[PDB]
Ligand binder design. Sequence first.
Ligand SMILES: O=C(/C=C\c1ccc(O)c(O)c1)O[C@@H]1C[C@](O)(C(=O)O)C[C@@H](O)[C@H]1O
Length: 397
Amino acid sequence: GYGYYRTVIFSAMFGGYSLYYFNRKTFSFVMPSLVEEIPLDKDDLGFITSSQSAAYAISKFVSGVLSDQMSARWLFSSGLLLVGLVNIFFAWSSTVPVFAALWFLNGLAQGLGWPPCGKVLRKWFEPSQFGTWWAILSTSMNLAGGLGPILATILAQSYSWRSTLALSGALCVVVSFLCLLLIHNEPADVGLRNESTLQELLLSPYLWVLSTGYLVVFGVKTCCTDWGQFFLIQEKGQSALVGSSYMSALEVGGLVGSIAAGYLSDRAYGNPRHGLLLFMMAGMTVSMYLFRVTVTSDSPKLWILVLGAVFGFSSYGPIALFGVIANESAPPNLCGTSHAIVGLMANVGGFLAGLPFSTIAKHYSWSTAFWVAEVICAASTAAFFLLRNIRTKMGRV
Ligand SMILES: O=C(/C=C\c1ccc(O)c(O)c1)O[C@@H]1C[C@](O)(C(=O)O)C[C@@H](O)[C@H]1O
């Protein structure tokens, strides 16, 4: 029976990939309480996040390159176990070098679990149904972003910050074991039946336009999430519950954005679905400007929630659009390399959000850094609008 095994395996990957993201973002979930008991400046936080981002970038790139000669279940279980172990260790350390080393290892382990999902999806599902399943997998990510912050704060009001990560880590370990028991690599182990050149790929302007757009979008999203959580409390006179609700609403909006963008793009030199992407980017920068300027010490909370949801929608739509367009325009025999390059550029964009942004905020203010980010986003949107009727097919032409 294909259906039974498909359902079981997909549920197992859903749970494992949700725990992956939860343990990845636990630091952003608890950061305010940890800063409250251990006095730290913005530079230390930026250093830790940048170290994790760099480690994840290198590990994911190399694992994606060499994934063709490893088993999916073992890699998934190993990665989950290592992430749980480093999360458990994090709950006992109380210094800035140990935190940075532990999160570097966290990124290294988190980079391992990406290729197995694609391998299982390709082995167990039809080639014409990849993206759809990809889509729902992305929703799991958003789910981990939604339940994470608020619960953490709810636990923080009566328990230590160190009593959450540790518990989370334990869960991962247990789930990892269940994952190995519940994941089969191919529909044959159970028993039931189963051009261009590299010099021409990198010499395509559209390949760099897409990469730079993804870089900008990912960096701006990471900046908004972590440093707006801190911005709402440290400068706008709001409490930590509002800071957590802002991120929860951001992820709630991002879920519906990721779900819808595929439908709107599919119903609709250049690409047919560039207008939706440009509109979403414009909405993202407009919402950023409104959030920076309108919110004061005395403002209703459902205005902040609306701003967060709108930004999440306008940020998570373009990510799916970028992925689908990169898959569609890729050379016929170089899809994996193109996906790896675009992911690497998105990861370096996310890396740029940690330390330089925190240093700018430390020197001038949070407002100045957010204004710089919004200015960069507006300039990128204008440039993308200008550079939109160029060749979209990459390769030997
Ligand atoms: O391949 C994909 C994504 C979707 C995809 C694949 C085959 C398809 O046939 C399809 O319709 C859709 O990679 C994802 C997007 C990524 O940014 C990229 O594409 O560069 C890299 C990484 O971030 C991944 O999340």
